[PDB]
From a paper:
In eukaryotes, integration of sterols into the vacuolar/lysosomal membrane is critically dependent on the Niemann–Pick type C (NPC) system. The system consists of an integral membrane protein, called [name] in yeast, and NPC2, a luminal soluble protein that transfers sterols to the N-terminal domain ([name]) of [name] before membrane integration. [name] and hNPC1 share the same structural fold: an N-terminal domain ([name]), a middle-luminal domain, and a C-terminal domain found on the luminal side of the vacuolar/lysosomal membrane. The current transport model for the NPC system postulates that NPC2 binds sterols in the lumen and loads them into the [name], which transfers the sterol to a tunnel that is formed by the middle-luminal domain and C-terminal domain of hNPC1 and [name], respectively.
To study the substrate scope of [name], the [name] (residues 1–249 of [name]) was purified and crystallized with either ergosterol or cholesterol: ergosterol-bound structure at 2.4 Å (Rfree 26%) and cholesterol-bound structure at 2.6 Å (Rfree 26%). Ergosterol and cholesterol are highly similar in their chemical structure, but the quality of the electron density maps allows for clear discernment between the two in the [name] binding pocket. Cholesterol lacks this double bond in the iso-octyl chain, making it more flexible, and this is observed as density that is discontinuous with the ring system. The hydroxyl group of cholesterol is closer to Q80, 2.8 Å away. The substrate binding pockets of the two structures are virtually identical, with both substrates positioned parallel to helix 2. Structurally, however, the substrate binding pocket of the [name] from yeast is less occluded, with 10.2 Å between K90 and I172, compared with 8.1 Å between the equivalent residues in the [name] of hNPC1. Even though the binding pocket of the [name] is less occluded, cholesterol seems to bind 1.0 Å deeper compared with the [name] from hNPC1. The clear density of an ion in a well-defined cation coordination site on the “back” of the [name] was identified.
Numbering used by the authors: 20 to 241
Write the structure that this text describes.
């Protein structure tokens, strides 16, 4: 059914860190989602996951995904198109049934439980999707303190590659990624066993997820 790059967690790498995911082979098929995990996955990732029965994530992985998304949510919550694109990226990265085809584990280490945990991985990204994703978040204004939201979730990223690099770089102490995540844009077309991440993307002037003119340039009148 589903092909995963990782499933579950195999312990922590430090006494104060958090547990890290277990690399699984390509022939591994995850079990059916529990009722508890399925209901929680819908609350965190939206109604798109109601009919999903096989996912590449456990309940603990969804809870870790929820805790980290809720820390960055208030920074981009004013722009629904960015929030929708933002959550959609990390939800497929964690739970999509085709995770094993766009996530390539490249480096592992041993945990305190003496098991292999992810240390560094590659995510094959579709340039057009990452470009439109950055275009929907680059102009969000943090209210009151008159700043840019991209200065926090992106560290002041000037293009989409610097945006995903800020999101993927290992920042465990700063509430970021517990391990190194590299976004690759040069996946060869000859590689048929791999594929690039590509989903529906929403611009900040989209009708269903329109953002204010203060946060979206294309939503402003002329
Ligand atoms: C979004 O915006 C960002 C920001 O602008 C863009 O990111 C930049 O993208 C460009 C273009 O892709 C990259 O340029 C290449 O740089 C490498 C070396 O990178 C070093 O220098 C960068 C400059 O540093 C400045 O800032 C840093 C802080 O970042 C600061 O510390 C420093 O003081 C300075 O002020 C560094 O940023 C870079 O950091 C590394 O680590 C980063 C963190 O992980 C990483 O993100 C970076 O990507 C980088 O890896 C690093 O210190 C150059 O080698 C390369 O030039 C080669 O390629 C071109 C094109 O073919 C060619 O013209 C050159 O000749 C050169 O090719 C020679 O060198 C190759 C490497 O040795 C070798 O393989 C070749 O064979 C060739 O060697 C032959 O010729 C030479 C003579 O040229 C000869 O001596 C040899 O013997 C041999 O015969 C590029 O210039 C930037 O690195 C990158 N920066 C960052 C921060 O990402 C991004 O592209 C934008 N994206 C979009 C979608 O728009
Ligand atoms: C998804 O992620 C995967 C990683 O999890 C990616 O897999 C990696 O893919 C790359 C290419 O895309 C592979 O690189 C090739 O590796 C070949 C094997 O290298 C071995 O032999 C080299 C030459 O030796 C020849 O002769 C001897 C004796 O007859 C034979 O036994 C050999 O088979 C070969 O015919 C040798 O140079 C190499 O040693 C190190 O140096 C190379 C080049 O710099 C590096 O590839 C690497 O650093 C090698 O280190 C390896 O061994 C050391 C200890 O020796 C360990 O750290 C570790 O085990 C490391 O693997 C090595 O002995 C080579 O012939 C080719 O020229 C390419 O270099 C990677 O091997 C492969 N990693 C794997 C399978 O684990 C995958 O690409 C990625 N997918 C996508 C789509 O991105
Ligand atoms: C990265 O993301 C890109 C953006 O989503 C992907 O680009 C898409 O790629 C698909 C497949 O190649 C394209 O769909 C094709 O469109 C052409 C266009 O033909 C037009 O004219 C014919 C003739 O009448 C008509 O029948 C078509 O409907 C079109 O009107 C078609 O010929 C194909 O049959 C097919 O429908 C998308 O158009 C394209 N979207 C873009 C560029 O925005 C890209 O594939 C992704 N790459 C990777 C590696 O994942
Ligand atoms: C720099 C700060 C703002 C980070 C912004 C992006 C946040 C929301 C992203 C970046 C990398 C992401 C993590 C990458 C990998 C995993 C492992 C998985 O098993 C559970 C989700 C979890 C733990 C993700 C949670 C969300 C996360 C932390
Ligand atoms: Zn149905
Ligand atoms: Zn989706
Ligand atoms: Zn591409
Ligand atoms: Zn690296």
């Amino acid at each position: 059914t589903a092909t995963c790059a990782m499933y579950g967690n195999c312990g922590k790498k430090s006494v104060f860190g958090n547990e890290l995911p277990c690399p699984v082979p390509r022939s591994f098929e995850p079990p059916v989602l529990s009722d508890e995990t399925s209901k929680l996955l819908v609350e965190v990732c939206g109604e798109e996951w109601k009919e999903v029965r096989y996912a590449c994530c456990t309940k603990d992985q969804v809870v870790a995904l929820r805790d980290n998304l809720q820390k960055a949510q208030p920074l981009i919550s004013s722009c629904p198109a960015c929030l929708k694109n933002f959550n959609n990226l990390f939800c497929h990265f964690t739970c999509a049934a085709d995770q094993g085809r766009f996530v390539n584990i490249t480096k592992v280490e041993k945990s305190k439980e003496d098991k292999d945990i992810v240390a560094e991985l590659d995510v094959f990204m579709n340039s057009s999707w990452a470009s439109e994703f950055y275009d929907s978040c680059k102009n969000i204004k943090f209210s009151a303190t008159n700043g840019y939201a991209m200065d926090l979730i992106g560290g002041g990223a000037k293009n989409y590659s610097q945006f995903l690099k800020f999101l993927g770089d290992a920042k465990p102490m700063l509430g970021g990624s517990p391990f190194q995540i590299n976004y690759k844009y040069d996946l060869a077309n000859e590689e048929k066993e791999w594929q690039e991440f590509n989903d529906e993307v929403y611009a900040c002037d989209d009708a269903q997820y329109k953002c204010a003119c203060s946060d979206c340039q294309e939503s402003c009148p002329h």
